[PDB]
Each structure stands twice: as structure tokens, then as C-alpha cells.
Amino acid sequence: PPKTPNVVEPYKGEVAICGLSGRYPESANVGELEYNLFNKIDMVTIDNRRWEPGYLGTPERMGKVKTITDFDAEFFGVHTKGAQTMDPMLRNLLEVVYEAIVDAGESLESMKGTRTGVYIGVSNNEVDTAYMKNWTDDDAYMVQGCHHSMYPNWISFFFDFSGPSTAYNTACSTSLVCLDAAERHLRMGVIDNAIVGGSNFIYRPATTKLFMGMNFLGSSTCKAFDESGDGFVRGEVASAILLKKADTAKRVYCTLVGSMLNNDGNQTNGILYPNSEAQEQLMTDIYSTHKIDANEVKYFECHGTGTQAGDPNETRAICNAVCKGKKDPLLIGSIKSNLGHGETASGINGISKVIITMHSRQIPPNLHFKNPNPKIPGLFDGRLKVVTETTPFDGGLIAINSFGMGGTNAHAIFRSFDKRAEPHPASDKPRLFTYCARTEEGLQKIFEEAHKHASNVEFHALCQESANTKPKSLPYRGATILNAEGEYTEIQKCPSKAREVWFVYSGMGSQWVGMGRSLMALDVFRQSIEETAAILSPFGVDLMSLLMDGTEDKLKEIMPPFICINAIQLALTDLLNSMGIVPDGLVGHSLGEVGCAYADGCLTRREAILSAFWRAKA
Amino acid sequence: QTMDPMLRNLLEVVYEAIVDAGESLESMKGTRTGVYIGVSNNEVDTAYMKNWTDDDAYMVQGCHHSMYPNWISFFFDFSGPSTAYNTACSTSLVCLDAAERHLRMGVIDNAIVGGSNFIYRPATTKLFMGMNFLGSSTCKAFDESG
Amino acid sequence: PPKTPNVVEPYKGEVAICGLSGRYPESANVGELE
Amino acid sequence: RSKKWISTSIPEERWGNPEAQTADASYQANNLLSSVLFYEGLQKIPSNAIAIEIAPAGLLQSVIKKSLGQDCTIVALQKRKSPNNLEVFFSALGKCYSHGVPMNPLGLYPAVQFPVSIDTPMLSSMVSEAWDHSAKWRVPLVEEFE
Numbered sequence A: 001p002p003k004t005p006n007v008v009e010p011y012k013g014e015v016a017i018c019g020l021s022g023r024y025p026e027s028a029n030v031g032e033l034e035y036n037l038f039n040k041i042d043m044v045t046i047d048n049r050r051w052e053p054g055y056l057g058t059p060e061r062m063g064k065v066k067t068i069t070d071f072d073a074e075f076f077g078v079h080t081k082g083a084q085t086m087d088p089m090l091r092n093l094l095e096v097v098y099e100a101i102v103d104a105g106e107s108l109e110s111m112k113g114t115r116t117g118v119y120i121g122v123s124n125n126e127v128d129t130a131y132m133k134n135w136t137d138d139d140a141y142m143v144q145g146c147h148h149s150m151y152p153n154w155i156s157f158f159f160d161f162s163g164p165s166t167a168y169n170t171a172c173s174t175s176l177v178c179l180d181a182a183e184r185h186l187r188m189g190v191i192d193n194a195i196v197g198g199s200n201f202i203y204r205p206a207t208t209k210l211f212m213g214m215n216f217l218g219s220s221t222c223k224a225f226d227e228s229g230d231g232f233v234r235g236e237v238a239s240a241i242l243l244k245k246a247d248t249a250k251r252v253y254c255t256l257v258g259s260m261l262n263n264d265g266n267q268t269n270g271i272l273y274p275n276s277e278a279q280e281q282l283m284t285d286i287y288s289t290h291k292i293d294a295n296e297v298k299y300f301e302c303h304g305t306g307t308q309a310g311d312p313n314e315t316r317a318i319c320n321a322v323c324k325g326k327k328d329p330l331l332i333g334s335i336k337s338n339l340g341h342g343e344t345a346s347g348i349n350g351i352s353k354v355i356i357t358m359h360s361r362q363i364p365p366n367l368h369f370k371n372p373n374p375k376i377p378g379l380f381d382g383r384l385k386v387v388t389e390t391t392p393f394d395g396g397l398i399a400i401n402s403f404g405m406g407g408t409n410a411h412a413i414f415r416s417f418d419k420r421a422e423p424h425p426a427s428d429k430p431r432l433f434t435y436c437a438r439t440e441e442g443l444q445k446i447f448e449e450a451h452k453h454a455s456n457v458e459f460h461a462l463c464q465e466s467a468n469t470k471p472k473s474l475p476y477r478g479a480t481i482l483n484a485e486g487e488y489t490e491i492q493k494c495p496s497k498a499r500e501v502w503f504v505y506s507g508m509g510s511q512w513v514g515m516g517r518s519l520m521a522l523d524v525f526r527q528s529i530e531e532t533a534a535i536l537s538p539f540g541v542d543l544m545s546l547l548m549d550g551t552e553d554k555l556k557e558i559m560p561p562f563i564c565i566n567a568i569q570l571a572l573t574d575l576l577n578s579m580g581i582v583p584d585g586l587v588g589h590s591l592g593e594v595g596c597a598y599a600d601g602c603l604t605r606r607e608a609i610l611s612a613f614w615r616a617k618a
Numbered sequence B: 001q002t003m004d005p006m007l008r009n010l011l012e013v014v015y016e017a018i019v020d021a022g023e024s025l026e027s028m029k030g031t032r033t034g035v036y037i038g039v040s041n042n043e044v045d046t047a048y049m050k051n052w053t054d055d056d057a058y059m060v061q062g063c064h065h066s067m068y069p070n071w072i073s074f075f076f077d078f079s080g081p082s083t084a085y086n087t088a089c090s091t092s093l094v095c096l097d098a099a100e101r102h103l104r105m106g107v108i109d110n111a112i113v114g115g116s117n118f119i120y121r122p123a124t125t126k127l128f129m130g131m132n133f134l135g136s137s138t139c140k141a142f143d144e145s146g
Numbered sequence C: 001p002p003k004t005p006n007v008v009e010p011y012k013g014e015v016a017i018c019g020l021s022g023r024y025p026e027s028a029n030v031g032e033l034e
Numbered sequence D: 001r002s003k004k005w006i007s008t009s010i011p012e013e014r015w016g017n018p019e020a021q022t023a024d025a026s027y028q029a030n031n032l033l034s035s036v037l038f039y040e041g042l043q044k045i046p047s048n049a050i051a052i053e054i055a056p057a058g059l060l061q062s063v064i065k066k067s068l069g070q071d072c073t074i075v076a077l078q079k080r081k082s083p084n085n086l087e088v089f090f091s092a093l094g095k096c097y098s099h100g101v102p103m104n105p106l107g108l109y110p111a112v113q114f115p116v117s118i119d120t121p122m123l124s125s126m127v128s129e130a131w132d133h134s135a136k137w138r139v140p141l142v143e144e145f146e
């Protein structure tokens, strides 16, 4: 009955961002986002996905995700009534969180019960008015599916996390505020992981009209660092990331050097006015507290809203704080000229671009930067240089800013993880790639991607870390052979109930020339045969000779058949045991009982092989 | 006029609390103080948007939940983390936890942890009834008839 | 022009609640609530 | 001898006797001498078990399949005179996994040192496009905001 207290001790190690996933405008996943960014593809389009291009006079162009009507309600254990009375943002976020968890090499079983905190940042609550205009009974379930406090909690409930689950609303700089909280809680020792994230979808055109009345929005797409910039364009994001202690991370995109937050105070230019001094002080504090040489920053993910009052002040603060002492131009950029302004998901957007720049090791181009802003002297003095084309970022520190409306600024620094791949003994021999999914088409696509990376073993390991999920979560189980002479692929729907794995051992008559000759390719099989041949050598039996160059006449005798069959059975048992297959039951025919004893732990390799040798000798 | 009554009352209460602690406008101006307001109710938006007209754009700076702590930071000139929290019925203590976290590391020296909640929509109570959250009489804490 | 960094150092002393205020049902201030 | 291993040399009614406790020389002699009760041993197997025939060849494929029934999955790890047995072995285990048996195919190779290299592709994209999205749920409509 007594409960053992948790060891809440301060943590001094490194924090690594391990996973990333999310929906971005004109991008169903991170891969599409990366492709669009690196091909100078504009992700702000004009259509009637949300409303007509000009409805109520709102700007025609907007950043909209592909779809928000899709959700795998059964997977997350949510009934039809709850899913219907549920915010699409939270649905997409739950899917994105699961994708990010899988991306980091984690799984449902591994992350279940861990001390993980969820720090979703969401501010949009427009689905409450639409669902309440014609409220009827059975809509009460919105409280558990529509409340903003239910975004992280559901993640905690589904994944069984037992850490601080809180929702944050800081406006355009909420994602980095959640990152700050995650760093705070991780370093105190309450949690070992974090699910920092945030989603933002546009539903009400009147909200766009409300933003227009304040001069927030411009005419065209965000003209970051452009002299013609006059505003921003609204965007949609549902991204999320996973943070873990660097020592226990199976995949490390980068390391979180540190993040902090500050406020502007009573400025005479209005509450909705950026404070250059506040941002500069925040930058100075962050680069001084961690003793980070500001001249070491290679790329700077700026909060390029594109306004005439935001870009000049942000650039001035960056020039005063990070460009002091730099002997080369500092490459600045933003992810707002590509997909617009994500509002409460701008910081997650910057995190996504940074994790993409540091993964592909190339800085995505910046769009619509034609003429430098005359009010930004850094662009003419050589201190600043907008990355208008793909730049080969080799390694170092990348800084992100998130200046929320109202004056709540945020800064964060990430250090690149330089562990370039080295060849594995595998990646040139056949391998068995096994995985599970929710649909046959999804598993087929997974196998296609695995074949695309048949030469990568680390990718196989990451896939395998989450390839053992129970059939309940991922009923479609499949397997394919990478680097195979003949194509193989199997996909079947496995019921929730788990079937029994019984080992059946054959006896005499399984002999033939070349038995087990091909299986020598596997290291374990050859090792087992060698370790059995060494045992049987002193008794006048050269197992290797009988198994490799043995002929039919040799196998006609009594000894070689018994020896070879037992050797194959024991080697296959070793292969199965190494692969991690535990038999619930063992049965065997005559001459296979020794193998059953060996696989059951009742006998040893020496005992089993000598038992067969004694049998045939007698 | 285009400001949430909760924000207005919270601003007045924050000033009263500041004065209560022996502090004053000049003394707290420029200090490294963080604001950790916890607010979740957003029923003031639908009513003001049902008949939206020009000049109502100022709701963004007077209606958004993110402006509760920010206004406190702006008026009192605080220069510390100003964030809004929504943790359901236990948000006020999560704000306290965040303030404790930020105070024990050195970013701030003071905190304005608080919280406001006013009931406007008569339909939200119906939502809570449909889940059996609400009872018949006053909260009968530790009572068998609760 | 240079900005002096703030001394962000962990704090190990006590944290004291100094002021309290608020509106409560049928109470215009803390005194009425009490 | 654990209960997982089903003896096929001692009658079911004599499993409780002391001789049916250890696989000593007496057990080997009895197995080499007495009859083999294969059918009885295959009756204790469940009706939907996944029996893996571990041997140089699938000798007892037909015998086992007839003995077990129709709902039991059967796989052979090797095939006689096969041009390539490694592929047969991998295909057999792939079939076994497809029917719901956990395993680690990477256990036959040296373990990968974590964290992995930064050159490892992203797994998020695969999962994103591998969801079950047949059903379409409610989404806010423009007509509901007026």
C-alpha cells in the first residue's frame, strides 16, 4: 500500500529533440514540407477550402492544411459521439503527436507510464461558437473534447503519461513558451520527456476581418525582410515535437542549449508594438547565461512577420546582440514567407524548419525577398544576409525567436547533432523488415519507403523500435525482405487476441545435401555450427565437413544425418532466440526431443549434441 | 468597451493585491516580475461577434486570453515571462507551480499568479448538466448526499 | 549601446506570498469574503 | 522440465510420475525405446496456435497441418533443395510475424549504437500517410458563424 516517492532531483545533462511531426499548409507531413521549402514552393494558395476567396472582404490567399475532416477515432479509443463533438485541431494534434513519438524511435508500450509532460499551446476556440449556434442534446461531450485544457490531457490520457499536462496561450510566441516550460520541468527532475507542441486552424472569417481592422494583415504573402512588406498572411499548423534526455534518446535531431522568455513592459508606442530593447536584452541574457559565443551562430530563424514595424526592430536587436564581433554575414531567415503566419503555431513552425535545416544540413531558401528593406541597415552593412537560396549549413548553433503580440518575447538556441553515419556490416545482405500499421495501403507505403532505404540499418532499427506494437493498436501486420534476390511482401490483419507461438521439431528424414548451407550467411547460424563442431571434433566427427562438402553417400550412414539434423535444429533455435521469439510451447518428434530440451532450457548445446551422438553411436 | 469584464476586474484586483503587499506603482515598475494569469472562459467572444461591427477590432488587444497577463505586464511595466494558462479546475495552482519554477532559477524576483472566471453564457451550464457535473443544491462537501 | 546581461542564477531562499486580492461571490473584497 | 515442453514419449497419464520430471539419460533412453505419441502431443496445442516447424526441411508440414486443424497457422523455416534457404527462412518468419508473434529481426546482426546518425530518414512521414481515414467527421462551417 505505501507508495515509493519519486526521486525529484535537478538534471544537468543535455536535452535533445528526438521527434517531429505536423501538418503544414499544402503539406500532409514533414517530408512534403521539406520538399516544398527546398523547391521554393509557395504554400499559401487561393481556393475555397475554408471560405470563398474574398468572403466578407478577407484576403484571398491563406495557408491551409490539406484536410481537417480526417481522424482515426478507433485507434485513440474515442467513440463516434466524442469524435464528432471534438475539435479538429485536437484530432490532428493527437495524430501528429503519435507520429512524432514513432519518429523518435519510441512506441506506445515504451512511452506508457513514463514521466512525460505535455505542453500543448492552443488559443483558437472558434469551434465553440459554431457548435453552439444550434446546440442540441448529445453535444455535452464537447467539454471533454472541445475545452482547451483537454489538448494535452488527452495526450496524457491516451499515452498514459504521468507528468504536468498544461495548455498555454501566449499568442504568436506560445510554442517557444511551452518549450521553455518543458526545459524548466525537465531540469528540475519531474519529467524525463516532453511533448511540446501546438495547433492552429482557421475557421471563422470574421476573425480574419477582426485582424484586418487592426492593420495586422497585408495584401500579398509575407514579404519578410522586403521593403514592400505590409503585413502577414494567416496559416495553419498542427505540429508537435518530443524532447528527451540526451542519454536515453534513440534519435537526436539536435540539442536544446537553452530557451528563455521576457516581456516588453510599458512602451510608449502601444501594447501591439515590438520592443527592440526587450528582445535585445533577452538575446543578451540567453547568450550570457549559457556562456554561448553569439558569434558561433550559423543560421538565425527570425520571426519574420513581414510588417514595417516588426522586421526592422527584430533585425536591429539581432544585429546588436548576435552580430557584434561576427567577421562574416549572419544568415537570417524565416518560415513565414513560405507558409505565412501560423499565429499560435509560429514557434513550432520555426522549430520544424530548424529541425529540417539541421537534418538535411541545408538552409531552406527564403521567398519573396526581392529588395532589401531600407530601414534594415544590417542588410547593406554586410552584417545580415537573407538566405534566398539553399545554403550548406555544416554545423553549429541555430537561434529562433518568437515575439508574441502584447510583448511576450521568446528566444531559444539549438546545437546541431554531428554523428554522421558509418557503414554497418548489414545494409548489403538480406534483412527482414517487419512493421505494423492501420491500413494495408499505409503498410505498403511503409514497405516502399523501407525499400528506398534498404542500405540504412539505423532506419531499420528506428522502425523496429515501434514495430512490436500490439495488434489492437495497429491491426495490419506485415513483413518484407530488403536486399532480397526475390521480392517478398506479406500484409495481414491480425485480430486483437494474441495467438500461441509453438515450436515443432522434426526428426529423421530431414537430411539432404546442402542442409543449412545457405543459412551460413547469417553470422549467428555459422557461429552456432562452429561452436557445435568444436564440441564434436574430439569425438571423431568433423561437422563442418559433413555439412559443407558432405555428399549423399556420407549422409547414407547413421552418424552424419543425426549430427547434421541436431546441428541445424540447435542453430535454428539460436537464430530464433537471438531474434527474440519466446515459445509458449515446445513439441518434437523422435530425435527432436533433444532440440526441444535445448530450446526449453532443460539441456545445453553440449548435452544435446552429445545425446544425439550417443544415440547414433549406440 | 471591447474588453472582457474578467480582464478589467483582474487588473483592478492585481493593483489591489500589489498595494496590499506594501508595494506601489513606482516600486514595481521595471522589476523582473512574471505574470501567470490562468483563464479559460472565452464566452465573451461569441456575444461580441454575433453582431460584429467596425471599431470592434480592439477585442484582439482586449479580448484575447493572451492579453490578460500581457496587459498586467504592459501597465505595471513588468519585464518577465507573462503567460496565460488553462489547466481546467486546477489552473490556478499550475500558475503557482510555474511561478515557483521561474523564481527558483533567477529570471524573476516577483510573480503575479492569479486567476479569473466569470459566467456569461447560460448554455455552458447546460453543457455541465449533461455530464452530471452539477448537483441540485449547494456543494455538499464531504456529505453523503453530495 | 551594449546591454549588460542579467545575472540569471538559481535562487535557494524562501518564497513569500505578500499580497492577496480578488472578487468573490457576494463579496466585493477579501474582507467581505472573510 | 517446464510445462511448455510437451513430452511425446511418455503417456499423458504418466506425466506426473517422477521419470517425467527431468530429461536425464533415462528420459533419452525411454524416448529412444518407447513409442512416439505425436498426435496426443499435438492435441494439447490450441486451436489457433502458430506452429513453427524448426528443421532442415518442412518434413512434417502435411502431418502437422492435418493433426492441428484449420485455424492453426503453419510455417516451415526451411525448404528442401531450395535454391536459397535464407530467403525461405526470412519469408517464414515474416509470415509468422504477420499473424501476431513479436520478434526482433535485427537480433541477428550487431546492435546499432544509439542515438542514431543524423542521416537517418524521418519516420513521421510514413506514419502520417498510413492512417485509417475512411470516416469524415464534423468540421465548423462558415454558415454557423453568422
Ligand SMILES: CC(C)(COP(=O)(O)OP(=O)(O)OC[C@H]1O[C@@H](n2cnc3c(N)ncnc32)[C@H](O)[C@@H]1OP(=O)(O)O)[C@@H](O)C(=O)NCCC(=O)NCCSC(=O)CC(=O)O
Pocket (backbone or CB within 6 Å): A507, A508, A509, A510, A511, A512, A589, A590, A591, A592, A615, D032, D057, D058, D059, D060, D061, D062, D063, D076, D078, D079, D080
Ligand atoms: C512420411 C514422412 C516421412 C513425410 O513424407 P510425405 O511426402 O508424405 O510428407 P510431405 O509430402 O507433406 O512433405 C515432405 C517434405 O519432407 C521432404 N522429404 C520427404 N521425404 C523425404 C526423404 N526421404 N528424404 C529427405 N526429405 C524428404 C520433402 O522434400 C518435403 O520437403 P518440403 O515440404 O519442405 O518441400 C513423415 O510423415 C514422417 O514423419 N514419417 C515417419 C518418420 C518418423 O517419424 N520416424 C520415427 C523415428 S526416426 C528418428 O527420429 C531417429 C531416431 O528414432 O533415433
